[PDB]
């Protein structure tokens, strides 16, 4: 007999990105100035997502 | 690096003088043309196709080796999967200092 069988395999997922400043502080200026003192967290995070 | 170079030299020397045998059991000697004839049988071609035109096959092998060594003394991105790895490690440590 001749039989055909199906097999499903995932290949990719969704590409995502985040604005660190907009998520943490929003529109606040004071929060942004306080966020500048937490250096090299947002860059290290965008690099992983990219 | 000298130990790894010794390992790969031993591996190439065993391949050139023994064949497929020094991975299954012990090493068994065989001439290189007969080894190449066996591999030609392996890909589905008879032994004569090697044996009447062995000289042009040897010439093509030598030319391909000489073309590889030319292309290595040329620009980058040939070894780009290795260099990238090195860069990543260094980059991580730099962050851990600036942090």
């Amino acid at each position: 007999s001749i039989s055909i069988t199906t097999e499903v395999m995932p290949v990719s997922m969704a590409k995502t990105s985040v604005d660190c400043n907009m998520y943490i502080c929003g529109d606040s200026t004071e929060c942004a100035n306080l966020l500048l003192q937490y250096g090299s967290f947002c860059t290290q995070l965008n690099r992983a997502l990219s | 690096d000298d130990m790894i170079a010794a390992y790969t030299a031993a591996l190439v020397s065993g391949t050139a003088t023994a064949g497929w045998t020094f991975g299954a059991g012990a090493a068994l000697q065989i001439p290189f043309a007969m080894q190449m004839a066996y591999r030609f049988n392996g890909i589905g071609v008879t032994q004569n196709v090697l044996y009447e035109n062995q000289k042009q096959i040897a010439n093509q092998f030598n030319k391909a080796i000489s073309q590889i060594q030319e292309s290595l003394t040329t620009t980058s991105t040939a070894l780009g999967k290795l260099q990238d790895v090195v860069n990543q490690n260094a980059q991580a440590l730099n962050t851990l200092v600036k942090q």
Binding site: - | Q47, N48, E52
Partner: protein
């Protein structure tokens, strides 16, 4: 895992092909070996010498191309 390992090797001298009457003869599955008195054909993994016949050998070309040709007789059951 149960596996097969070859055990005791032995030296022979060999040729790529033999020449009977102006024709090159190549083995089908095996190698030509020289026992010390006669030339046989044998499989690579086990030593079982077989007499060279027309059955286990095929013909291609003349005896003026292959490097390492030798002179020997090919038996025919006739």
């Amino acid at each position: 895992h149960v596996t097969y390992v070859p055990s005791q090797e032995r030296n022979f001298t060999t040729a790529p092909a033999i020449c009977h009457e102006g024709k090159a003869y190549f083995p089908r599955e095996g190698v030509f070996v020289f026992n010390g008195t006669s030339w046989f054909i044998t499989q690579r993994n086990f030593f079982s010498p077989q007499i060279i016949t027309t059955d286990n050998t095929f013909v291609s070309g003349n005896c003026d191309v292959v490097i390492g040709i030798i002179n020997n007789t090919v038996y025919d059951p006739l």
